[PDB]
Amino acid sequence: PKMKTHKMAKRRIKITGTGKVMAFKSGKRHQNTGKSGDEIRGKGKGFVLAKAEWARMKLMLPR
Amino acid sequence: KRTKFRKQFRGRMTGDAKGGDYVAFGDYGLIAMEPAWIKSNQIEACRIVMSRHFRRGGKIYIRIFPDKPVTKKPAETRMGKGKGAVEYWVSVVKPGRVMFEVAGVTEEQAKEAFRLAGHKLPIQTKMVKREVYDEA
Amino acid sequence: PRIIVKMESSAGTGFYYTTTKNRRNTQAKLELKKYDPVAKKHVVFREKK
Amino acid sequence: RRKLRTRRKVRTTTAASGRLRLSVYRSSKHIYAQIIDDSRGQTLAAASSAALKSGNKTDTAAAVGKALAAAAAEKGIKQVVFDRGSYKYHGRVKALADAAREGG
Amino acid sequence: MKIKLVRSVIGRPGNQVKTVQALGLRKIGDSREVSDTPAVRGMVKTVKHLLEVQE
Amino acid sequence: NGRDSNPKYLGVKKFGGEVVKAGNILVRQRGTKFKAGQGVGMGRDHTLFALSDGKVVFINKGKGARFISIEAAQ
RNA sequence: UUCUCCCCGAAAUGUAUUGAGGUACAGCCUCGGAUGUUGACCAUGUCCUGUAGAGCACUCACAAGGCUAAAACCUUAUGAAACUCCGAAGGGGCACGCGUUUAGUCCGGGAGUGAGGCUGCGAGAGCUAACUUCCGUAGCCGAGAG
RNA sequence: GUUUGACUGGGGCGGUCGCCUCCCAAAAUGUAACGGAGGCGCCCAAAGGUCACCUCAAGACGGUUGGAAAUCGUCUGUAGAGCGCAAAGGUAGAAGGUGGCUUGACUGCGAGACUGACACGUCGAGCAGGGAGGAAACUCGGGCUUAGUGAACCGGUGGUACCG
Ligand SMILES: [Mg+2]
Ligand SMILES: [Mg+2]
Ligand SMILES: [Mg+2]
Ligand SMILES: [Mg+2]
Ligand SMILES: [Mg+2]
Ligand SMILES: [Mg+2]
Ligand SMILES: [Mg+2]
Ligand SMILES: [Mg+2]
Ligand SMILES: [Mg+2]
Ligand SMILES: [Mg+2]
Ligand SMILES: [Mg+2]
Ligand SMILES: [Mg+2]
Ligand SMILES: [Mg+2]
Ligand SMILES: [Mg+2]
Ligand SMILES: [Mg+2]
Ligand SMILES: [Mg+2]
Ligand SMILES: [Mg+2]
Ligand SMILES: [Mg+2]
Ligand SMILES: [Mg+2]
Ligand SMILES: [Mg+2]
Ligand SMILES: [Mg+2]
Ligand SMILES: [Mg+2]
Ligand SMILES: [Mg+2]
Ligand SMILES: [Mg+2]
Ligand SMILES: [Mg+2]
Ligand SMILES: [Mg+2]
Ligand SMILES: [Mg+2]
Ligand SMILES: [Mg+2]
Ligand SMILES: [Mg+2]
Ligand SMILES: [Mg+2]
Ligand SMILES: [Mg+2]
Ligand SMILES: [Mg+2]
Ligand SMILES: [Mg+2]
Ligand SMILES: [Mg+2]
Ligand SMILES: [Mg+2]
Ligand SMILES: [Mg+2]
Ligand SMILES: [Mg+2]
């Protein structure tokens, strides 16, 4: 069998072509407003390093 | 004896002393040869001995001074909270450092007074009259 | 109790807010600043809320 | 009176990158002006008014700016710094300016 | 500038070991002929107690 | 009365005679032990960073007042 | 936790953990591919540092005199982890090789280790005690017979 | 039916658990202890942008209330002050003290770097929209820096008009 873990689905992973793992930008994501303008602006990367193997096996087909 | 001063506790190691190898005040001087702590009552016993032998006369200088706190843990506990708050004050003493020096007393009586005072110090020590001197 | 609350400022007939902690000590009177909202250039945002 | 001199002199040679210096001296009736290339230890285009005379100091100095604007104009002077000495951008040195770069 | 090992690497610090290894010596009783250029002189100085420098 | 402390790495990061690319950080410091030189910029925490690529170089005069600076290649 | 010989060969560290004799990631091992001297040592050049020492110029402490409404201030004289007018030896980054050596890096499969121990040097805690304890550093044991 | 933490020179009682500063820390960075000291969970519509101006502690002599220190005057005076809170670095060509106009305590971005196992965290030229102060060069995307903090989930509110 081998189901993918659905927690990873719309959760900040996605599979870039060329096999790299996506992620989102988290800190101060919600509930904080003495954070600076760029900081609120700083979300949206997902390049993420030595975790990738596990993130991959979280999603077999990229759901 | 105890200073009226600052931070309670310290550390410890050693190297030969610099801050008083030469006898400025007075005529003669007993002088340390070993690197022990001296501390408080050890000195004060030196003082009280020499003041017995000499006083009514002479000038007594104590160039050394119990600067350094030393600690005792309580009683019988395990290596526990922190260090122990009190116990006794010491003066580190390195060879060539001058602790004592008399004034206005004949050579021989200074011999006997240094002998008495040094029979109750942890270090052995040697006396001298001042050679020629510089450092002014 | 509480002293210097967080105050949200509606822009002057815009659609966007800004939010900051105007201290309620000396700042007894409602905030009136200027800032760039959804549309034009800097305008008066009225930090009433 | 001192600190304002070195104050504006530090803020001038910070803002000085490319642009040349223009140090108006005003303490006397000598409202001399210079154009100094910071870096190179050189001036190139001074316009002192020891020979000129036009009346009140505010208007005498005016011509000094004009004299200077012609001199630097012959050398190919872009813009410049300004480098006030201590004098609070007042009508005589403000006039030396309006006269300098109105005619630049 | 003849050299040989005459004392083991073992139980000697790291720079001494890697220097013995640089100079070309991998066993006690190895010998070698080394130029006198400043860096080689510095190497053969760094571990001179391990080496019977000839002259 | 003991447990406390804290760990914030500081220091010179790009030493003289090194080729910094522009935007490189060259010193982290708490005050102005180094003053930003010709070609150098300093942020809120008095970090000095390259304004344009070049050779990093140090000017020392009296430890009240030394400056890091860039001498561009070419 | 059972058959053989051959090659390489660790860890007892870091950060996190209802975590502390467990586990994740990193670190260190091995294998295959790629580059292909970028590695190592030692030299020269350059920059950074506040330790050893020393010194009282500031802070605190402090010894004998002088002046004196005792404070300051003068001569003489000291101590310092949380003092420093000064300040090495060493140490770190970068370039270069002017010179010898032989690794290094990237990519992917398999790990184990995360209880360390002693001694010399540098400190703390402790009695300047411990086959003591916690860090730093070198080497051996660990897994090393002779 | 279950819950009823961990560290811990045995466990318990006591104490501690995140964050900042100094010594320890052996002149790079890093470095443990129920080692030695001390602070934070904020504050400020001005203590911020900018633009203009001023310069401190302390002592001596002289002077109304005073009577060692108040206020005023001359002299000396790298700082012996000040910097909202701790300490350290820094600081007088100010970051200190005062006034003017003001909000850049911005939107969309982010070359390139510091730092961390990760996730976080720091600095930042320069580009556009649009502003503020200055005559101008130019400075402004909060504060002299370093503490004033909380992933995710689940939800309140306002836009948007992607899904449905
Ligand atoms: Mg089936
Ligand atoms: Mg996709
Ligand atoms: Mg010694
Ligand atoms: Mg010795
Ligand atoms: Mg001396
Ligand atoms: Mg030996
Ligand atoms: Mg082998
Ligand atoms: Mg952590
Ligand atoms: Mg464990
Ligand atoms: Mg692993
Ligand atoms: Mg390989
Ligand atoms: Mg390399
Ligand atoms: Mg090489
Ligand atoms: Mg010392
Ligand atoms: Mg000198
Ligand atoms: Mg080569
Ligand atoms: Mg792998
Ligand atoms: Mg296998
Ligand atoms: Mg362990
Ligand atoms: Mg160990
Ligand atoms: Mg002790
Ligand atoms: Mg042991
Ligand atoms: Mg074992
Ligand atoms: Mg053996
Ligand atoms: Mg071995
Ligand atoms: Mg044996
Ligand atoms: Mg059950
Ligand atoms: Mg327990
Ligand atoms: Mg407590
Ligand atoms: Mg260090
Ligand atoms: Mg070191
Ligand atoms: Mg450790
Ligand atoms: Mg201690
Ligand atoms: Mg200012
Ligand atoms: Mg204007
Ligand atoms: Mg900018
Ligand atoms: Mg909604």
Side-chain angles (χ1 to χ4, degrees), chain A residues 1-7 9 13-21 23-27 29-46 48-52 55-59 61-63, chain B residues 1-3 6-8 10-38 40-55 57-136, chain C residues 1-5 9-12 14 16 18-20 25 28 31-32 36-39 43-44 47 49, chain D residues 1-31 33-104, chain E, chain F residues 1-2 4-5 7 9-74:
Chain A
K2 174 52 162 314
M3 355 188 190
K4 79 196 45 175
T5 221
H6 269 24
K7 93 179 304 83
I13 42 286
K14 6 129 80 148
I15 343 64
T16 187
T18 72
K20 234 315 123 174
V21 274
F24 276 64
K25 210 65 194 184
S26 66
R29 169 261 201 190
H30 268 357
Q31 69 195 357
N32 90 144
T33 75
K35 249 310 79 259
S36 97
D38 156 290
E39 274 29 40
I40 303 189
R41 255 181 38 245
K43 356 306 335 184
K45 122 290 170 79
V48 100
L49 353 179
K51 101 96 125 183
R56 319 288 268 309
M57 322 153 197
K58 213 84 86 310
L59 292 165
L61 27 148
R63 185 243 121 121
Chain B
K1 289 164 55 283
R2 61 278 248 94
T3 105
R6 172 51 322 211
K7 296 256 244 221
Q8 9 232 40
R10 311 266 251 72
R12 37 176 159 174
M13 193 147 167
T14 280
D16 173 321
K18 27 104 165 169
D21 73 78
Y22 65 153
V23 66
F25 313 56
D27 285 320
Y28 314 138
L30 170 71
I31 204 171
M33 296 284 76
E34 303 202 41
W37 300 345
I38 268 57
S40 71
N41 47 284
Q42 289 142 92
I43 300 173
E44 228 274 352
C46 282
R47 205 261 305 184
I48 289 187
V49 183
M50 282 175 295
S51 162
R52 297 201 191 302
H53 182 9
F54 268 145
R55 278 301 221 295
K59 242 289 66 216
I60 240 80
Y61 305 105
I62 298 150
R63 315 246 277 101
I64 141 168
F65 190 100
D67 160 8
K68 186 191 194 63
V70 181
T71 53
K72 258 252 197 173
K73 289 230 60 173
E76 68 352 275
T77 347
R78 279 68 172 297
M79 314 298 224
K81 210 169 176 49
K83 0 172 32 207
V86 172
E87 187 54 334
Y88 59 10
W89 263 271
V90 201
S91 154
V92 316
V93 163
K94 257 287 161 163
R97 176 130 188 62
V98 188
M99 315 182 277
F100 308 94
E101 55 337 86
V102 284
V105 318
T106 79
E107 156 145 6
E108 156 51 56
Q109 42 206 204
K111 287 295 174 287
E112 172 63 340
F114 284 156
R115 194 199 66 152
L116 294 191
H119 251 103
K120 56 236 314 165
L121 287 155
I123 66 244
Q124 46 200 21
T125 56
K126 165 181 49 192
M127 80 89 220
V128 287
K129 93 90 177 76
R130 48 156 160 104
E131 84 134 359
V132 297
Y133 267 146
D134 355 317
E135 225 236 80
Chain C
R2 225 136 275 129
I3 349 162
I4 70 293
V5 274
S9 354
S10 307
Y16 121 157
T18 190
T19 96
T20 236
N25 8 315
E31 283 297 55
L32 277 141
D36 159 77
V38 41
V43 81
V44 134
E47 334 221 47
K49 47 71 68 282
Chain D
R1 178 158 197 89
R2 169 61 88 98
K3 282 158 212 143
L4 241 173
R5 213 177 69 199
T6 1
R7 147 177 18 182
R8 294 306 164 165
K9 240 66 118 50
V10 130
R11 184 137 127 187
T12 179
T13 291
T14 283
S17 287
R19 293 170 156 266
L20 279 326
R21 293 211 235 110
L22 164 66
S23 197
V24 1
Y25 182 85
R26 161 83 243 181
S27 298
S28 170
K29 279 75 269 162
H30 183 306
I31 177 168
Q34 308 208 266
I35 292 300
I36 323 78
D37 181 331
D38 48 326
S39 72
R40 304 153 136 195
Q42 299 164 311
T43 317
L44 23 278
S48 75
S49 172
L52 301 200
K53 82 177 89 313
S54 186
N56 62 349
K57 318 87 140 259
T58 157
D59 114 57
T60 291
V64 201
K66 196 209 307 172
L68 185 68
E74 277 155 299
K75 335 241 175 172
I77 257 45
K78 287 64 65 196
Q79 285 291 317
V80 60
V81 76
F82 127 86
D83 189 332
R84 150 209 47 232
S86 357
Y87 321 77
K88 262 296 63 172
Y89 194 64
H90 208 278
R92 44 181 159 192
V93 38
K94 167 199 180 176
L96 190 168
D98 296 21
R101 245 44 194 63
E102 161 74 44
Chain E
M1 234 314 176
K2 233 144 167 292
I3 315 297
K4 73 249 50 196
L5 224 5
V6 233
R7 311 222 44 54
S8 53
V9 274
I10 341 179
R12 279 324 208 298
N15 62 350
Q16 319 223 2
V17 83
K18 303 172 185 72
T19 281
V20 159
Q21 177 216 37
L23 247 95
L25 298 174
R26 330 230 241 75
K27 304 185 173 169
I28 68 154
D30 272 353
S31 190
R32 93 143 2 192
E33 194 62 48
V34 87
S35 61
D36 249 3
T37 29
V40 146
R41 263 175 308 244
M43 286 167 57
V44 89
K45 187 113 321 76
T46 274
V47 318
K48 53 170 185 162
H49 30 277
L50 331 188
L51 296 162
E52 172 173 359
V53 170
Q54 191 94 309
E55 268 169 350
Chain F
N1 356 72
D4 315 309
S5 224
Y9 332 63
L10 291 189
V12 204
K13 291 293 181 199
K14 278 295 193 165
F15 300 79
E18 270 181 296
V19 190
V20 324
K21 258 172 173 181
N24 282 6
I25 322 244
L26 317 125
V27 112
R28 279 168 169 308
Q29 89 212 296
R30 275 5 201 38
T32 291
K33 180 156 86 80
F34 295 99
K35 333 229 190 122
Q38 236 259 349
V40 193
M42 142 184 17
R44 285 180 38 170
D45 67 290
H46 319 156
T47 326
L48 311 183
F49 57 81
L51 255 354
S52 73
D53 336 54
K55 170 173 84 182
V56 126
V57 168
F58 275 72
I59 278 64
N60 201 120
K61 203 322 80 170
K63 190 104 80 88
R66 344 184 282 174
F67 317 77
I68 293 192
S69 32
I70 307 168
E71 290 179 12
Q74 311 162 16

